[PDB]
Scaffold this active site. Structure first.
Site, PDB file in Angstrom:
ATOM      1  N   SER B 148       0.779  -1.224   0.000  1.00 35.00           N
ATOM      2  CA  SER B 148       0.000   0.000   0.000  1.00 35.00           C
ATOM      3  C   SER B 148       0.824   1.295   0.000  1.00 35.00           C
ATOM      4  O   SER B 148       2.054   1.278  -0.004  1.00 35.00           O
ATOM      5  CB  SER B 148      -0.935  -0.022   1.221  1.00 35.00           C
ATOM      6  OG  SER B 148      -0.177  -0.178   2.425  1.00 35.00           O
ATOM      7  N   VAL B 186      -6.466   4.592  13.588  1.00 37.95           N
ATOM      8  CA  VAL B 186      -5.375   4.020  14.381  1.00 37.95           C
ATOM      9  C   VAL B 186      -4.100   4.866  14.363  1.00 37.95           C
ATOM     10  O   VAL B 186      -3.540   5.160  15.427  1.00 37.95           O
ATOM     11  CB  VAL B 186      -5.059   2.549  13.949  1.00 37.95           C
ATOM     12  CG1 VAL B 186      -4.150   1.876  14.985  1.00 37.95           C
ATOM     13  CG2 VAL B 186      -6.359   1.759  13.840  1.00 37.95           C
ATOM     14  N   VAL B 189      -4.519   8.272  16.187  1.00 37.68           N
ATOM     15  CA  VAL B 189      -4.481   8.136  17.632  1.00 37.68           C
ATOM     16  C   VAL B 189      -3.084   7.758  18.154  1.00 37.68           C
ATOM     17  O   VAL B 189      -2.621   8.320  19.141  1.00 37.68           O
ATOM     18  CB  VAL B 189      -5.541   7.117  18.107  1.00 37.68           C
ATOM     19  CG1 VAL B 189      -5.381   6.845  19.568  1.00 37.68           C
ATOM     20  CG2 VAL B 189      -6.944   7.682  17.870  1.00 37.68           C
ATOM     21  N   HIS B 450      -1.606 -16.050  38.871  1.00 39.96           N
ATOM     22  CA  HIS B 450      -1.901 -14.908  39.729  1.00 39.96           C
ATOM     23  C   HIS B 450      -0.571 -14.348  40.222  1.00 39.96           C
ATOM     24  O   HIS B 450       0.283 -15.092  40.688  1.00 39.96           O
ATOM     25  CB  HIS B 450      -2.748 -15.315  40.941  1.00 39.96           C
ATOM     26  CG  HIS B 450      -3.076 -14.162  41.843  1.00 39.96           C
ATOM     27  ND1 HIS B 450      -4.026 -13.216  41.525  1.00 39.96           N
ATOM     28  CD2 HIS B 450      -2.491 -13.734  42.987  1.00 39.96           C
ATOM     29  CE1 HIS B 450      -4.012 -12.254  42.432  1.00 39.96           C
ATOM     30  NE2 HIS B 450      -3.089 -12.544  43.330  1.00 39.96           N
TER      31      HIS B 450
END
Ligand code: FAD
Ligand code: FAD
Ligand code: NAI
Ligand code: NAI
Lengths: 471, 472
Positions: B148, B186, B189, B450
């Site tokens: 692109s 995107v 930002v 955890h």
């Protein structure tokens, strides 16, 4: 006097999670906690405070050291304010313990403050500090009393100069020289924190590798080497003969080769004893009740976590299996689900382990030693973070991802990570193992670019096909 | 001096270089043609890599210069920005990674041809170098991975100096005092955040009513926008830029107005970033002579094996339909080449995650609530805030939540949306879940370590499955 369906003795990971889940299941639930706060070992003197210090010390290292400057963040001077750093630690601990008080309230779990003792196969008496008691008649008793530090005979911990992980988490000053007995998880984590803040640290270890039980030897070896380059020194295959506190305040630590001989003495300012933890069950009433502990002090239980007495259960650090917080919580949840009629099943091979140093270390499933010992024909896939896009971009490239796959079915048998983001990454691995996913399965899942998870994906590709793309 | 091959890959970006390597590893004599001075296409040179380097360094600057480190007992005299040094770190990474591709091509036997390639026959590609030199490649297959280019804004011409595309925005020589960004997608930002953090006064003007581009879940987008605004990032939504002009002053005036019309006005800035999208690049490839017609958006139509109308000629990545993302292009390249070797070819764009690397990060895979609604899918929702997550709380990085969408009856996970710390990494466990057709319950029952940010993912599935999570 009051009653309940389920009475859980212990507000630690296993205990408070069980209380909550039982309540959410429709049980009248009471939770008894002897300490001044809920949360047990993990919240007050364990997981939480250690991770906070691990976090702050690493950031201090990045600022004070060479990292930030290399990134264009220039700072004239960088000084440690240990008082404020410990303050941040305490704030997290205060907030999280409060959270449990709030969660109990929200789920209408009733909090009984006091030292519980099983006074009757359907009763538990909570005796406060002022002697004032409280009785609880209940249908089921869930023991979640946890663990305590395992003492080293001959050495008496005073949490001042000779400490356990508890004292080490609240050292008033950065020790100039620190000796750690036990190069396990706490040793490497707490050693690393104080090493970063300026201490000269040496870990003395009886076995020949660092990281505790179950860690993969290749991973353990590479981890040690990286920590050593950070300043962390190790004396492996060495026994501690004894330790004496001297009138000048210094501490002399006598050592020898584990196989005898090579006597030596190491002098330090602080000694950290961390050779493991053990189940805590004193004055609970088990001898009375008939509950016999195993030789290691654990409460024996069947697949549904119930003791000899069918309505009395035990979960967490007080029972067999890895002494980890997520393991205790899961057992709490399934134990009370079992109380409600559901099936009860846990597979410890699927419980991950994480070391929160920097680099982090994490694994789930089998190590190569385990597979060789079991005669398993397997495949190995390795991928260095040095070839990972996100790691290289972040300029933080230590380590690798190592995948062990079954030769015949390509099933993932073990996942081992040494490097950035290992602790989070191992959960994608735990999920894979739960489904019995293959190395190829993982390799074909589209992972976001650029992320650390891609090292994981490529290691599986290597294990599966023989070659990854980027290495 | 003609060279022959089984597979000739035109383009060395994510799609092309991975396809070339994969093809070589599968046994194909492979050639990869690249017109630029380096390998790696957009992603490595002026995209993914340098933007993430800046995002990472600018975030750390913020943590140091701001109140974060101070709150941790890490006291600093005067935190200063050495923009030159920071740009250097970014560049060192780009150089290392681009050089890495060259080494991988060598390791795998990929023949690298420098020059602008053109398909000059069903089985022939000609690459013309800058010096006019020529190299012909007779090949069994052709893989178009031409990528692109930035989508130009008519009327505003980009000079990569004061009026820039993401390329100039990645190499600004100094922090602009004031910056306006066209498009709150995107790129807008991410780069807007970078410069904002480094001292710039930033405003993004967006024609649509939300930030984050296509596909982002609306609830997530609004929560994200609000968090960005608290950071100082300004947005003018449902607003269209009608033009820009540069004054003798040096500054540029941007004329804007309501997207529907009226409300006209002018704003002024030092730098104008034009990022209203990217588009497929197929220039002078010879498609018109081959009879290969592009769709309305300029993309090359391909079948399930990525074959164009002419079966031994393929296309993948940014030149074809689907999300214009690096991982999408890379996967398309691998499966395309595997198909050439006779294997199955499968890609489900619903399982291709999306990530926004701001802080907090945004990440998703699967369907958004709006997609499920327009599709008529009956679903349930499970949420868990990072404020109640232990790792997040201990690190004092508690913005956001995980949102899980499950099918009302089957409990199958249909979509995962994450706003907060560790989103980019966490979305991959979610992608593994979607591939397996996991149920919310399956996830809530796997033992997560955890304390980890991932536990929020687990809890949110538990909430969607059982009705309540444990810690919230
Ligand atoms: C420094 C350190 C760091 C750690 N880091 C991690 C980590 O990062 N990840 C991880 O998974 N694990 C970590 N652990 C281990 C983890 O904390 C424990 O496995 C976990 O707390 C075990 O949970 P438990 O609920 O069974 O027991 P515990 O949390 O040990 O105890 C539960 C409670 O029982 C109470 N109690 C005991 N007897 C009675 C009684 N008779 N009446 C009333 N109350 C009673 C105790 O006072 C305690 O509050 C760490 C441990 C330490 C020491
Ligand atoms: C600022 C920015 C940030 C981005 N960040 C991310 C991100 O974080 N994550 C993500 O997934 N995506 C990101 N992207 C998008 C990503 O870069 C693209 O999706 C990706 O590069 C597409 O890969 P590709 O191989 O199809 O094409 P490209 O990489 O655009 O191009 C491949 C190559 O084709 C060459 N070429 C073209 N025509 C010819 C020809 N005729 N002869 C020879 N060579 C030719 C080009 O010069 C180029 O090197 C970002 C893009 C930008 C601009
Ligand atoms: N991040 C995490 O998941 C954390 C988990 N924990 C867990 O808490 C429990 C206790 O941790 P640790 O105390 O580190 O136990 P450990 O088993 O992890 O490490 C103890 C170390 O002491 C060594 N050792 C034992 N006796 C010795 C002796 N006499 N002389 C010299 N060395 C000796 C052992 O070989 C081991 O290397 C474990 O379950 C541990 O995994 C602790 C901290 C962090
Ligand atoms: N983190 C990641 O994965 C990244 C991916 N990319 C990808 O690169 C490609 C291009 O990104 P972007 O340039 O950000 O395109 P985008 O599609 O993400 O956003 C372009 C924005 O321009 C807006 N717009 C169009 N015309 C306008 C006008 N006249 N005035 C105001 N607003 C207008 C559109 O509504 C859209 O919101 C996408 O595929 C994107 O996903 C780019 C950066 C990062």
């Amino acid at each position: 006097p009051i009653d309940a369906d389920v009475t859980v003795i212990g507000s630690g990971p296993g205990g408070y999670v069980a209380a909550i889940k039982a309540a959410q299941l429709g049980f009248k639930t009471v939770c008894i906690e002897k300490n001044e706060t809920l949360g047990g070992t993990c919240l007050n003197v364990g997981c939480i405070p250690s991770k906070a210090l691990l976090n702050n010390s690493h950031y201090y290292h990045m600022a004070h050291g060479t990292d930030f400057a290399s990134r264009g963040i220039e700072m004239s001077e960088v000084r440690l304010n240990l008082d404020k750093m410990m303050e941040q630690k305490s704030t997290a601990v205060k907030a999280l313990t409060g959270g449990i008080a709030h969660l109990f309230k929200q789920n209408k779990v009733v909090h009984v403050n006091g030292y519980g003792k099983i006074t009757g196969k359907n009763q538990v008496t909570a005796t406060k500090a002022d002697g004032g008691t409280q009785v609880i008649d209940t249908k089921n008793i869930l023991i979640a009393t946890g663990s305590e530090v395992t003492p080293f005979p001959g050495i008496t911990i005073d949490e001042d100069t000779i400490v356990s992980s508890t004292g080490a988490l609240s050292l008033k000053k950065v020790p100039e020289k620190m000796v750690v007995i036990g190069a396990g998880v706490i040793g490497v984590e707490l050693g690393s924190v104080w090493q970063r803040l300026g201490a000269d640290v040496t870990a003395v270890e009886f076995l020949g590798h660092v990281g505790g039980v179950g860690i993969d030897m290749e991973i353990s070896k590479n981890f040690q080497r990286i920590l050593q380059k950070q300043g962390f020194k190790f004396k492996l295959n060495t026994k501690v003969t004894g330790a004496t506190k001297k009138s000048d305040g210094k501490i002399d630590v006598s050592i020898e080769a584990a196989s005898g001989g090579k006597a030596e003495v190491i002098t330090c300012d602080v000694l950290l004893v961390c050779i493991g933890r053990r189940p805590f069950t004193k004055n609970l009433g088990l001898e009375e009740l008939g509950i016999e502990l195993d030789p290691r002090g654990r409460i024996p239980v069947n697949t549904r976590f119930q003791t000899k007495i069918p309505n009395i259960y035990a979960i967490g650090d007080v029972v067999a299996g890895p002494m980890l917080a997520h393991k205790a919580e899961d057992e709490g949840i399934i134990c009370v689900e079992g109380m409600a009629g559901g099936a009860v099943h846990i597979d410890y091979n699927c419980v991950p382990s994480v070391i929160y140093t920097h680099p982090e270390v994490a694994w789930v499933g089998k190590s190569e030693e385990q597979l060789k010992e079991e005669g398993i024909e397997y495949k190995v896939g390795k991928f260095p973070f040095a070839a990972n896009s996100r790691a290289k971009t972040n300029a933080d490239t230590d380590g690798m991802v190592k995948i062990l796959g079954q030769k015949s079915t390509d099933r993932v048998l073990g996942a081992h990570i040494l490097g950035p983001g290992a602790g989070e990454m191992v959960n994608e691995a735990a999920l894979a193992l739960e489904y019995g996913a293959s190395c190829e399965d993982i390799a074909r899942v589209c992972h976001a670019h650029p992320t650390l998870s891609e090292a994981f994906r490529e290691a599986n590709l290597a294990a599966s096909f023989g070659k990854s793309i980027n290495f």
